[PDB]
Amino acid sequence: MELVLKDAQSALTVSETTFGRDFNEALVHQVVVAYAAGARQGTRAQKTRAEVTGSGKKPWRQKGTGRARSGSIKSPIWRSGGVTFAARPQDHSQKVNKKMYRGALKSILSELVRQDRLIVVEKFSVEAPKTKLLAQKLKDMALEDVLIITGELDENLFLAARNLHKVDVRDATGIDPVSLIAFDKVVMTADAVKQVEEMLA
C-alpha cells in the first residue's frame, strides 16, 4: 500500500490490511457510540418517596372520609412527592473488544485514504510556540479544520495549537476514531504512520 507525501512528493509503504480495508460501518458506529458513552459523566439523582423530606403519617384515615385512600404525603402522585423510578448515578461505559476497536480504526483510516482526507508529511514543526506561526503554516497547507498527529512531544506545537478550535494536536498513541471522523483533514507524521502500523499490525 503506498501513500504519496504532500511536501516532498515521495512514497511511503504501508500495510494494505491497515490502510486499504473495506469500510465496516456497523463496527465503526459501534465504536463511536461506545466512545461517546464513555465520555458520559452520569452524575444525576432524583429523590424517591423514601428520600423526600417528610413524615410517614397517613394524611387522613383510611375510610369514613369522602376522599381517596392515601398512605403517604411522599407519594409520587402528589405535588412535591417522590419520583417513581428516581435515577441513580450510573456508569454508561460500554465494553469494546480490542479487535473491534482496531478493526474500526483500520476501517476509518482506509476510508480517509479513499476520501483523500489523509495527509502525510515527513515532519510538521513550528519553531516558536506561536499560534500565528501555526496559522500561517496551515494557511500555506490550505488547512483549517485539522487533526495533527505527531509521534513525538512537541510543546511549542501543542501551545501554538491550543487556542485554535479548528485544530487539534495529538500524539500517535492518543488518537481516537471520533476525532479522526470529526476533523476534516488528518496530518500524519511518517513516523506516526510507522507507530500506528506497529500498534495495529
Binding site: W60, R61, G64, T65, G66, R67
Partner: peptide, 27 residues
C-alpha cells in the same frame, strides 16, 4: 389574607359525627 385552614385536613369529617342514623335494620 393569611386565609388558610379551609380544606387542610377537612377536620369537617375528622369530626366523623356519629353516623348509622339508627338503621341497623339492614342486618
Amino acid at each position: 389574607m393569611s386565609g388558610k385552614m379551609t380544606g387542610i385536613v377537612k377536620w369537617f369529617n375528622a369530626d366523623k359525627g356519629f353516623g348509622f342514623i339508627t338503621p341497623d335494620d339492614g342486618s
